[PDB]
Amino acid sequence: GPLGGAGDGAPVGLDLDRLARDCDVVGGQLALHHQGTLTTWEFGTEEHAGGRPVHVGSAFPYGSVTKAFTATAVLQLAGDGDLDLDRPVRELLPEAEAHPALAATLRQLLSHTAGLPSDHDDERAPSLRRWLTGFLALPVGPWPAPGSFSYSNVGYGIAGRVVEAVTGLTWSEAVRDFLLHPLGTAITVLPTDPGSLPAGGLAGSAADLVRLGRLHLDEPGDPDLARLADPDALREMARPTAGADPFGLADGWGPGLGRFGPAGNRWLGHDGTLDGATCHLRIHPGRGTVVALTTNSPTGQALWDAVVDALRDADIDVGVHRPAPPPAIAAAAFADCTGTYRNGDLAVTVGIDGPYLVLELPGGARELAQPLAHRTFSSRGAGFLGRFVTDADAVHALQYSGRTLLRE
Numbered sequence: 234g235p236l237g238g239a240g241d242g243a244p245v246g247l248d249l250d251r252l253a254r255d256c257d258v259v260g261g262q263l264a265l266h267h268q269g270t271l272t273t274w275e276f277g278t279e280e281h282a283g284g285r286p287v288h289v290g291s292a293f294p295y296g297s298v299t300k301a302f303t304a305t306a307v308l309q310l311a312g313d314g315d316l317d318l319d320r321p322v323r324e325l326l327p328e329a330e331a332h333p334a335l336a337a338t339l340r341q342l343l344s345h346t347a348g349l350p351s352d353h354d355d356e357r358a359p360s361l362r363r364w365l366t367g368f369l370a371l372p373v374g375p376w377p378a379p380g381s382f383s384y385s386n387v388g389y390g391i392a393g394r395v396v397e398a399v400t401g402l403t404w405s406e407a408v409r410d411f412l413l414h415p416l417g418t419a420i421t422v423l424p425t426d427p428g429s430l431p432a433g434g435l436a437g438s439a440a441d442l443v444r445l446g447r448l449h450l451d452e453p454g455d456p457d458l459a460r461l462a463d464p465d466a467l468r469e470m471a472r473p474t475a476g477a478d479p480f481g482l483a484d485g486w487g488p489g490l491g492r493f494g495p496a497g498n499r500w501l502g503h504d505g506t507l508d509g510a511t512c513h514l515r516i517h518p519g520r521g522t523v524v525a526l527t528t529n530s531p532t533g534q535a536l537w538d539a540v541v542d543a544l545r546d547a548d549i550d551v552g553v554h555r556p557a558p559p560p561a562i563a564a565a566a567f568a569d570c571t572g573t574y575r576n577g578d579l580a581v582t583v584g585i586d587g588p589y590l591v592l593e594l595p596g597g598a599r600e601l602a603q604p605l606a607h608r609t610f611s612s613r614g615a616g617f618l619g620r621f622v623t624d625a626d627a628v629h630a631l632q633y634s635g636r637t638l639l640r641e
Contacts, residue, residue, distance in 0.1 A: 239520070243267050244547035249274040252543065253528075256535040260287040261511075261528030263540060264439035266447050267549065268521060269454045273440050279529065292421060292436045293527035296505025298512045299435040300389050302420075302445060303404075304343045304489020305462065306412050307392055308470055312463025315399050318488065325395050329362075332369050333376070334387070339395060341379065342388035343488035344474035348379030349387045350577030351636045356426055361394040361404055364428030375575045377630075377637035382477040382486055383576070384635040386432035393431025404431055415461045416444045433505065439525040446516040446523030449490075449501060454521070471501055471518055481618045482635035483554050490516070494552025502552075506534060513537045515551050524551055534615065556618055559606040564588050567604055570621045574631040574638030581631060581638050589613065592633065 249263055253276045260277030275287045295302075310316045316325060316339065323335035337347035353371070358364035368387060377383035393404040400407045405422045413420045420437035422430065447453045449467055473485035473492055485492035490501040493515065502515035511533030513526045524544070526537050541551045564585045573582045582593040590602040590610050602610035608621040608628065622630040622637070631638045 239268060241548035243270055243272040244544060244549070247274070247543055247547070249540070250276045252539045253277055253536055256532050256539055258528045258530045258532045258536045260291075261293070261526065261530070261533060261536070262287060262289065262291060262439035263524070263526045264443040265525075265544075265549075266443045266450075266454075266521075266523040271440065271443065277529075281529070289440055290419065290438055291527075292419075292438060293512065293529060294423065294433075294505070294508060294510050295435045295437065295442065295512045295527075296433050296507050296510065298442070298503045298505040298514050299431070299433045300343075301490055301503045301514065302408055302412055302435055303389055303393055303396075303431045304470060305445065305448065305467070306396055306408050307339055307343060308466045308489065309411055309462045310396065310399055311469070312466030316395065318469065322391060322395055325398055326365075326391075329365055329369060329394075333373060333379075334369060334391060337379065337388070337391070339392060340469075340474060340488050342385075342392045343470075344477050344486055345382050345384050345388060345479070345635075346380050346474060346477050347385065347388045347391075348377055348381075348383070349385040349391075350374070350376050350579070351383070351385050351387070352577055352579055353387045353390070353428065354426065355428055358426065358428050361390060361397055361427050361431070364390060364426070365394050368428075374577065375639045375641075377576070377639075380476050381637065382479045382635065383637040384479075384482070386429065387577075389432040390428045390430075396431075408435075412445075412461075415457070416441070416448065417457065418444055433507075439527045442512070442514055442525035442527070443523045446514060446525065449516050449518055450521050450523065451518045452521060479635050480620060480632055481556075491554075492552075493554050495555075498550055498552050500552025506531070511537065515553075517552070522549060522551075524549075558611050558616070558618055559609050562604050562606045564590060564604045566606075567608075567610075567621075570608065570628050570631075573641045574633075575641055576636050576638040579636075579638070580641075581633055583631065 263274040318340045341347035353368045418441035470489045477486040479486045483491035500515045505512040511528045579595045584591045592600045601613045619633040621628045
């Protein structure tokens with residue numbers, strides 16, 4: 234008070250085993266770098282039917298949090314002067330040009346504002362080069378507009394291909410040699426599509442995830458991390474890209490990291506929660522706090538919320554996206570919104586089933602949503618918001634899970 238402080242230290246006596254049992258998470262890790270000190274928690278088993286208990290070194294899929302590594306490796310080459318964030322990647326991939334996708338800058342690709350579809354799957358492509366060649370041969374089809382946020386794995390595949398062109402290594406070699414090994418981690422590459430690797434192919438521990446987050450701190454607390462990446466280059470990832478409104482996902486988005494929290498407490502980070510496992514990363518460079526949670530269960534979303542609420546009681550206020558949904562509305566207000574919406578070859582069909590909206594997702598999946606005012610809906614249970622988009626006045630697109638899907 235009179236002479237100033239930084240706040241309280243790491244949470245004392247936080248029983249992550251109890252919280253994990255309350256949320257019925259099979260196993261996972263939480264790791265926290267706070268005021269120069271690393272604290273880790275492990276709970277449960279690596280497998281659902283029991284077996285080996287999770288230890289500090291257990292590996293969990295990072296899912297989309299892999300993107301933070303890919304972008305960090307891009308910005309690392311930025312400080313070295315080997316690439317330019319605002320130049321069209323066609324100048325860095327002149328062989329691929331021989332296109333709307335190559336007119337995008339690395340800033341746009343890492344920010345999901347490059348106007349690209351969410352997915353392009355090619356399991357037979359042996360390289361990011363052959364993967365890109367096949368994607369550029371597709372018809373342009375239904376793509377979101379450049380400059381607006383629409384989550385895209387394709388953008389991160391292109392960004393990974395730029396890394397290969399600049400360094401002369403494969404993406405897996407570059408990320409290991411330039412990032413994974415110098416960070417001092419045992420992070421492994423999962424055996425998946427080469428074209429999906431830059432978007433979601435890394436796996437490792439929560440402690441090792443924190444090591445990446447420490448790199449983005451104003452003081453990383455380690456000379457090995459300090460010399461690894463240019464602080465001026467990484468700060469670009471700490472700044473929002475203008476015009477990127479990631480409705481339903483985050484309050485903002487920069488070149489490789491989401492922004493989470495209200496004004497005055499915006500945190501950097503990234504989540505990954507496909508495939509029945511969860512990964513959550515949050516970074517606050519100013520306060521010097523990094524938190525990462527890994528779990529092998531979809532209930533890790535509930536555990537993350539309980540960890541955030543528990544950390545708040547310990548004077549650590551993690552930034553999270555908690556938007557104010559519009560008031561509930563009768564489902565009939567969405568009569569003009571029913572139809573099919575497409576992003577690349579992905580399609581979502583919207584219908585009205587009694588009082589709720591029903592979303593038919595690709596892959597046979599299905600989700601119900603609560604109808605709200607202003608063309609907005611809330612996923613039943615999780616509360617994740619989506620919305621239908623009108624041309625300033627008919628509806629022509631759907632914003633769902635951070636992706637723009639144009640109405641057929």
